[PDB]
Amino acid sequence: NLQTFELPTEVTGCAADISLGRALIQAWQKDGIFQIKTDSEQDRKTQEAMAASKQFCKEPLTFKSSCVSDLTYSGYVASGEEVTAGKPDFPEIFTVCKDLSVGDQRVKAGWPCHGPVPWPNNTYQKSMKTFMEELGLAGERLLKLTALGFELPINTFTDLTRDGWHHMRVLRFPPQTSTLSRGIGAHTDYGLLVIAAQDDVGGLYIRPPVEGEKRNRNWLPGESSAGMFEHDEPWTFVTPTPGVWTVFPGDILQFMTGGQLLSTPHKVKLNTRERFACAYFHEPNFEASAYPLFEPSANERIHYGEHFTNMFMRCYPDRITTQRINKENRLAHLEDLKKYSDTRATGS
């Protein structure tokens, strides 16, 4: 049974906030996950997003497949299209990344992954943006609490998330139809926090921290976490529960905390009925570099946008977005923007 916490609306650094931050860290260190209570508006926005997802998934495959972009990874992923650890995953997905028109300077500059969401319609757009605004408010609360729990300045993590590269996967898992039960293979996600919601069906499993168990650093090309531990216990079933979102760390928190927090491995198994879920990623700015918090002399860094881009290219090797990155050599822009960007997101 997972811990469930109610977060304060504002985090100021008072003793109660520090205490809550300590408890969140302890819950992640024991269970790998906790739940946060939703209020009526958070719940309403969650349910409206789930409803919009169900309606979109009923549309014809040709229409769903048209919701793609060769500039951004936002848009539709068919069942069987994404790859995890060399094997196809079976949800159909709509990914929402930062919604930037071709009038945005980063898009004009050809920055990888920057472009407009191919929304299926404007009611879907509004439902997802409203939900993501609420999710982001929670993400910022969680990051301030986490800083306080580690005895860090309250803004330590939020100083990296201004115009953060927040994104969301809006998922529908089919019922199991063959001998294959795999929904999504074991993996870790890539940013600071994952905040997730699900319907009543059930299928998400997470791996808690295991004493002595070494964890791959998924930001290194030589240590992908995809597939790791797939068939080894322990795996905790995330029981569907009304009125909560779940929260677990992503790769950036594992790196920055030197493993004091671990990016929680997780997987999804198909059930006897279709399953709707949404996974939200509260991320650094695309241009931000994560750094080790507890080793000031350590020179290792993670350029967040580079990690995102690498990951999405490995998930979607044949997507038009990936093809255009390769064709126009957009990973070069990525090394160039490190030194010549004029967004003022980083640097003097």
Ligand SMILES: N=C(NO)NCCC[C@H](N)C(=O)O
């Ligand atoms: N968070 C994302 N974005 O595509 N996918 C999660 C599944 C794992 C992903 N396919 C990987 O190989 O790492």
Ligand SMILES: O=C(O)CCC(=O)C(=O)O
């Ligand atoms: O289906 C879920 O509950 C979570 C799916 C997930 O891990 C993801 O999309 O990254």
Ligand SMILES: [Mn+2]
């Ligand atoms: Mn995931």
